[PDB]
């Protein structure tokens, strides 16, 4: 506590939620990442609802596909109504993508704001 470092909110949406790089191609998803951890969420260019999980891990670069069913998003199984909310409380509980896989997810990594 203290005159800083205090952010009073609930969360950002998925829209300025920075790992959230939009729908950036898939070169640009994968050329960005560079140790075992670093992840990003894009939407498919051309597929508007269908969001792509990039995350380094093993040395490949691990990518997976968020399904929207029972009205909730998910990787493996059990899902969330939000997207952001999905990945934070996915984040901060460390649990695995999809349990297939094996991966975590540690420090997202930001986006660029490309204008152009």
Do not use: C
Not at 21 to 36: T, V
Not at 40 to 59: A, Q, T
Not at 95 to 116: A, C, E, R, Y
């Amino acid at each position: 506590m203290g005159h800083h470092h205090h952010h009073h909110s609930h969360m950002k949406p998925l829209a300025e939620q920075d790992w959230y790089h939009g729908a950036i191609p898939r070169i640009e998803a994968q050329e960005l990442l560079k140790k075992q951890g670093d992840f990003l969420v894009r939407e498919s260019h051309g597929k508007p609802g269908e969001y792509v999980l990039s995350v380094y891990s093993d040395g490949q670069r691990r990518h997976f596909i968020i399904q929207y069913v029972d009205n909730m998003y998910r990787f493996e199984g059990t899902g969330f109504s939000n997207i952001p909310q999905l990945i934070d409380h996915h984040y901060t509980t460390k649990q695995v993508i999809t349990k297939k896989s094996g991966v975590v997810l540690l420090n997202p990594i930001p986006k660029d704001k490309k204008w152009i």
